[PDB]
């Protein structure tokens, strides 16, 4: 018997990174309205997901609009959600002789001090890819894997010849945006 | 003592789908050249990967150039590789009451005959996303998940109320471009 | 007086990027006082919907355009699939020079030369200078990647077909507008 | 007479999309007869390299630009990182109407109106008509998604600030060129 007069969404704006999420609050007026149910909706669902409780999750770079609409009265308020780039910062996961630099959503694989170096890698349940790593020109090597998303699972190991003869590396698993690096 | 005179790559062009691969042949002249080693390289490695044996794998929509260069003489030939879109065709994986349509690289989740329907899903090792599915307006529901790639692993189940009361579905696993559907 | 329900017409439709489909909302009784609806879209990157329910395809994917009633806020949906540009081949030039349009990439080409460069600009971006890749039979190619509908490519070649080097005249390609022959 | 080796200068460099960095190849002995190199790139979608080693950033990612010697075909590499456009906010308009540039999306806005539509065209694409989304305090927003450097946006609004409806004049935004104030 106490009708909804209005709604507002707080925060009214928010920046998340990909895989990051932010809880939104629908504020229904008056305080003692009989029906305080709202429907959450988003106009760019490839940018950000919203749950039935207004938890918003960053899916991909962009700005979108999340709307709370009241069950009683169909009053609507909206917030602007900016999903930001993965920082351009370099994070080393590996050692002097071989591993990864995570550089945003590309992975730069490296082998220092070899006569050659191949990378063997797979992403999620896609197949093995074998690549010869590019020579820097000083006995060092690199190969970029491009455009991973949050939760991409990377299994890789190297083949290379540091002197004595060609050596295989132990496989490693990298999950994009969960494997901790060293922020160098 | 028999020097390389030239090289050609066959096929000279090729279309693959994403996750599809094509073996390329470097033809070194003359036939009895002492050194027949070549280096394979690709100018758009976000489009297609090439192995040290000239196996080319479709990574993402585009056209790129794969080059064989001879170890002896640095003679170069190149092929054009077109990585094609995942067909726009609709493939149903699920039943009368609930599952997926695979429509290119988007997944259309569905629940037929409910008073409401939520989807619970996760991709690779990213987190759970909870979404209320959109009403069609006849007791039916849909929710598109966007832009999966080859080997994306999707675990999902539904919550919905077909009458008696709200019911949870058994979890299912979908691997993008490996789970077989029904081409409808 | 009240409205009771609504569904949308069509319920599912497939478009190419850059193409449109007119949506129409049918609201239960004709003797419903208020007919007017609001159009919205779940996935605005994929498809845009006008205030009168015209859906245009912007990018590959499937999205949900919903009509909600002014009187009632009853809601119904169409599933819109935006299909990618065919990887058919479209030749725009002559035996010596031009593009192949292969979906959203352009394969620029020069046939019969000792080198070939490309000079191109996309819309109001900067000019880029590139050496075209040798094929190994006196011909050259260079892919420009991932053009979107309405992209405007200005370009000319520098090549030497033997009796000395040449700059061709600038041509204008508009992506999804300019046409050629496929074969 | 021969060349013995080469490395590239710089070895690693980071650019924004649309920005450039001059690469230089240093080939072992100065008393190497032939100095000339060929520039190539592993990832042409990410970065373009000119015949004289100028690398321009086209799109987010890391790629390898290699200099190989004409005499010797010795090869060396730089790792190029192309950084995304900051998600800083850039206001281009007044208290009533304009855009926020937020990385590669534009948030169009009208403040203080009873409705607001956007009319926009991108480069030589078609005009799109959209109803701007109510905020719930008499203001309106509408994101345009994923513009690339050099994209040319023509737009005007239809809104009613109370004493009746208005079409504003068309403005031209060029992505990464047009500027405003961030704050
Ligand atoms: Cl979207
Ligand atoms: Cl949006
Ligand atoms: Cl690439
Ligand atoms: Cl390429
Ligand atoms: Cl959607
Ligand atoms: Cl690369």
UniProtKB/TrEMBL annotation, chains A, B:
It comes from the Bacteria. Residues 85-176 form the CBM56 domain. Mg(2+) binds at residue 64. One of its GO terms (molecular function) is carbohydrate binding. GO terms for biological process: carbohydrate metabolic process. Keywords: Glycosidase, Hydrolase, Metal-binding, Signal. Belongs to the glycosyl hydrolase 16 family. This is Beta-1,3-glucanase. It comes from Niallia circulans (Bacillus circulans). The chain holds residues 694 to 877 of 877 of the full protein.
TrEMBL record, chains C, D:
It comes from Niallia circulans (Bacillus circulans). Residues 84-175 form the CBM56 domain. Belongs to the glycosyl hydrolase 16 family. Mg(2+) binds at residue 63. This is Beta-1,3-glucanase.
């Amino acid at each position: 018997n106490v009708p909804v007069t209005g709604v507002t969404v707080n925060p009214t704006t928010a920046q998340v990174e990909v895989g990051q999420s932010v809880q939104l609050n629908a504020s229904v007026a008056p305080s003692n309205a009989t029906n305080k149910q709202v429907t959450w909706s988003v106009s760019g669902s490839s940018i950000a997901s919203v749950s039935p409780n207004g938890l918003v999750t960053g899916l991909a770079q962009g700005t979108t609009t999340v709307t709370a609409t009241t069950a009683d009265g169909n009053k609507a308020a909206s917030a602007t959600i900016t999903v930001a780039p993965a920082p351009s910062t370099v994070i080393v996961i590996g050692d002097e002789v071989k591993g990864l630099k995570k550089i945003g959503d590309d992975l730069l694989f490296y082998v220092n001090g070899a006569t050659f170096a191949d990378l063997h890698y797979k992403v999620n349940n896609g197949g093995q890819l074998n690549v010869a790593m590019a020579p820097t020109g000083n006995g060092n090597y690199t190969y970029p894997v491009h455009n991973l998303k949050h939760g991409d699972t990377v299994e890789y190991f190297f083949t290379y010849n540091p002197g004595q003869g060609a050596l295989d590396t132990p496989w490693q698993t990298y999950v994009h945006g969960v494997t901790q690096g060293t922020p160098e």
